[PDB]
Amino acid sequence: SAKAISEQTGKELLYKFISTTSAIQNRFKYARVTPDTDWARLLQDHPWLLSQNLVVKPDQLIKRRGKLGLVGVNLTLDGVKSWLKPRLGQEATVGKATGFLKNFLIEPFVPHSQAEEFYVCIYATREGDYVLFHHEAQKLLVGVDEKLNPEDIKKHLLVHAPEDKKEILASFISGLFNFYEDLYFTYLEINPLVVTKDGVYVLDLAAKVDATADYICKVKWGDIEFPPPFGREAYPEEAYIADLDAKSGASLKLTLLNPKGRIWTMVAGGGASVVYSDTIGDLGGVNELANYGEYSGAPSEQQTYDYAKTILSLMTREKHPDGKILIIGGSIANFTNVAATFKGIVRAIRDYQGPLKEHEVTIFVRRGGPNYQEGLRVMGEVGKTTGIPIHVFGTETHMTAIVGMALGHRPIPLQGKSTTLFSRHTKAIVWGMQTRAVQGMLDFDYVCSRDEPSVAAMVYPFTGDHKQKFYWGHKEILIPVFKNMADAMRKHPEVDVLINFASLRSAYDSTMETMNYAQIRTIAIIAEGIPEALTRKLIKKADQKGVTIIGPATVGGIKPGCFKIGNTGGMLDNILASKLYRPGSVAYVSRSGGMSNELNNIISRTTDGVYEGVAIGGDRYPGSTFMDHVLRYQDTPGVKMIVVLGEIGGTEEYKICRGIKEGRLTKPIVCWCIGTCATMFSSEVQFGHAGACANQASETAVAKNQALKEAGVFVPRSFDELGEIIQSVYEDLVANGVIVPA
């Protein structure tokens, strides 16, 4: 996800790495002040503080500090100390948010005139990075993998600028853009840039970097800090979890909202965790909600133990009169092992059992997934042996039902790429060492009564060629593994799908390499954590070649009767339970992988069942969008209704609205956009999925659910009535003859 950095951090990167050819002034002339500052050392380290007038302001991701009057301008050093004296340590109000002014920046005062002030901004979109310039806006798009033409700067951005400043402005803008790409920024605004006879001064800097690029930018970023939004604090336990996430193929996230709240969550999945938070917010619990976070991607027992013990420690610092509740939730997992993770949580609960009884904690559990029956048994076990109240619920209880149980009372003390991607004839190559996931596909293929396994070969460049044993029914079979992708392709021209399990570090090159083989028309990219600038380049090549990308950061998708991507839908018992071995009439698309297995469950209980599901993944720029898949479903005869599970952030869902108005979409669509709680928070909350950042009022789930409903989409009041509305629509289509069940 993209994360904001402080003005000081941004300026420090700029002073270290922007090309010296632009005439940057006051390089490294800044001084950080916090309550514990040693002013003597400060004057030693920054002797220019004693020899010129100064500007001082807080550096805590407050915007428009000037018009709020949080800027002391043209002061001597003692004028700065007096200016700080009634302000440092004191709380201020900015928007809905209130916090302490704890971090200030002193820089030199730069005399200038209005005419020497300029505005520059660079920001990322799917189609490239825009550059904005304004004297006192001109706009230029640098396309994905293109260069900034310094004569487009002069001819398009600087058309109204004084001719005597154009050459230094163009040099600065060129240098700023190279600086922006190389350090993986996604947003960079300088307002004002001051240009005088003596060179360029950077008076204000706001910026965001793609934090997933750390393995690329380590050296230059150094020990980079990502401040919380104004009105929250940073917590050592958040960094611990961040540290565990860095050491994990799995995803592990934690944000503390109100450490004193009595509602705590430990929910699996980035989607489900937002849905539980939504439900909590609809029942008035938001002010008591202590955290947001999630785990997913199959963490080990030990990782889950370490995550869980962090939560239990945080919830046993002080007592609440009414006790506290721990919501241990999630969807029906595709891939995460419920036994191993819940054994981790159980070990954490035992190790914290004294503090949990003392703080009057009630625990509510709802989970499904692989091995979920053992998991739920050991969960109920530790409740019996510790005497802590633990109320355990499985797949036949609705995902979010434990929330109302727990909160209802205090416990008693342009042409599309392709319409059809998969069929009963699909043959795939799997990139990676992924025996278990491949066996899970062959199991699906067998119970789907396919004539042939869906996996024809595998590629893994870190071993030599060999054959790998799998079971086909109960027969042993062999599947070739190739060191070289070239060998796998020329020996399997029948193959048209590649499922890429490469790690995030190797995913870009392995996917670009696949796209040199025109025989491959669909690629599933599993890995989470690919830098967005790299995904944009994957998107550009795939669009040039006509290749459908599903992912990144997804489990994939499933087509009952025909084909499933990797770990989608999980083990045999969930495939049978949710009847995913044969088709029904309902097609769906979600960002979230975990929630798509919940849709599998919900749709199978309320309809003839799933016809096709896709999870487009959580990243900011998915390889294929909601609309792409909804178009396929509109043009697919066997689909009779469409279910979209949307999400706060971006404006994709409004294309559905337009498709309806234009007459392009005509089957019945059901849609729910998750993230409605985000508006109830006093500070923005970055959810699990990289995409889930709302940049304007229209990107909120609430606005999207409203626009969708006005355009004739069927929208439930909340997620926990989605299953109801899906049922009723199906029933009308049965009553109208459109669907004829078996």
Ligand SMILES: O=C(O)C[C@@](O)(C(=O)O)[C@@H](O)C(=O)O
């Ligand atoms: O454990 C979960 O509920 C989430 C997830 O791990 C899953 O297993 O369904 C999903 O994020 C995935 O990546 O498969």
Ligand code: NA
């Ligand atoms: Na990780």
